[PDB]
Amino acid sequence: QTNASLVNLRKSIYLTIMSSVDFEECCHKLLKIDLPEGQEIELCNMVIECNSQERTYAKFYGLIGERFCKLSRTWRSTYEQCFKNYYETIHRYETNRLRNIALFFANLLSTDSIGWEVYDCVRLTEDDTTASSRIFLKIMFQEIVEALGLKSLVERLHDPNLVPYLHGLFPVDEARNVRFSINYFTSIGLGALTEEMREYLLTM
Amino acid sequence: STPELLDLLVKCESKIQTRVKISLNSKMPSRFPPAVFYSPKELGGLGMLSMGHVLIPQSDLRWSKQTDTGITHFRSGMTTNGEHLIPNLYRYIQPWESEFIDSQRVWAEYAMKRQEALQQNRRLTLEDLEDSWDRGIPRINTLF
Amino acid sequence: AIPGGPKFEPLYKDEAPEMEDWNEFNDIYKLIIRHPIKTEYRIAFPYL
């Protein structure tokens, strides 16, 4: 009967979100919805879906997400898993929904709400990247640049000192990956951060 | 962001409903469930839009006139007997800042597409702008 | 209002900003915050 139960849960979540004015009230109302113990992923998934379905990204949903992942740790882990899930399944969303999801996760990252652990699932190689993934990364990284300033961004990326190691963003020195990574990060507009691995091509 | 409009909207929507209640010579709340007022016109309801069925945030009044304190409590707005979640009108209106950002983006991309259609001898057409059809403060629709 | 007890009308509606001044007395600047002053305190020791 989980088909009907899931559908009822999604309808309740959507109505609760749509009957809300500010994110604080929406989080307060969403916590009141009793949900299965292992279905915390459903709430986050549908919050992201509702964010995507709208015409223009509104800070409402980003604020909701960061408040949940600031309330506890299970929500933070759930949102990291959501980013992982949405990355490989990004090719099936239109450009507008893709942009809305990218802004959602960029606002999550910019406030240190999920940690940049998630970038270890990103590999910038044509064997496992598409136009959709490149557009996703473009939008996310630009939005992070306005939010942080490209000054702090270079320390945040250059100095991981944790399990995020950017082994796909700054690809492990191998094959023609470095050329593509450098030229892509320039074409996006970042540029500044890739000069560190610019010299590797001279090394090899 | 204005907490006075929220309570004013609650009060004024309530009295708009009260006019209908009085014209029927009975303002009992049991007789008028939200389906009477908010169901669409084609179903026989009044088709009233709703914006006052929301929780009004509250903070300590001692430290409210002197500092911006976090929302620690919620005061209920218009009450719906039973479990009903009447949708908010504002949730279907895009906020001004998002609309302006999208406007800037869409008009910039339209300018570049107009330039790349002018550089060749083509004629700029619809179904070339289906992505940004109704976007921009002067909506793109106004071109065609 | 004690949260289990009755609620009445204000009995004193004179709280307008007729003074128009915060009086530089109750301001946060010169006040040591230790614990919030609950209304139970205002009822148990009404004159203090």
Partner: peptide, 29 residues
């Protein structure tokens, strides 16, 4: 009416009062 939260009387507003706790308040030689 209680700890600085609430309105003096529910008469005059289209509401019943009934203030709730936020339930989402982040309590950090």
């Amino acid at each position: 009416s209680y700890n600085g939260i609430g309105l003096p009387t529910p008469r005059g507003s289209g509401t019943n009062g009934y203030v709730m706790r936020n339930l989402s308040h982040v309590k950090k030689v």
